[PDB]
């Protein structure tokens, strides 16, 4: 209820929001890489179980 926001808290949230945006951009770059790799490994797999 009874506190005035200090300049240090605003800088702390601005540092942790920078870390959150970079975590969320790294996990996206990693999923894009994983999707590219999944596609690279599925293209190697020929679909026809009629082949001896």
């Amino acid at each position: 209820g009874t506190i005035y926001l200090q300049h240090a808290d605003e800088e702390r949230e601005k540092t942790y929001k920078l870390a959150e945006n970079i975590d969320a951009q790294l996990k996206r770059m990693a999923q894009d890489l994983k999707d590219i790799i999944e596609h690279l490994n599925t293209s190697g797999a020929p679909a026809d179980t009629s082949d001896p």
Partner: protein
């Protein structure tokens, strides 16, 4: 709950506040930084591989 309970009692000690300048990162802020370092290195290697 006990991590939060102890943390809440420490936050009332007027002798604790002057030591905070030299505090390490908290073990979640350091862990999110260790994961960001791990993910950056993976995203760097996987682009090469």
């Amino acid at each position: 709950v006990e991590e939060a309970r102890e943390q809440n009692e420490r936050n009332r000690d007027s002798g604790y506040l002057h030591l905070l300048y030299k505090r390490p990162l908290d073990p979640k802020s350091e862990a999110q930084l260790q994961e960001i370092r791990r993910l950056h290195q993976y995203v760097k290697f996987a682009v090469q591989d």
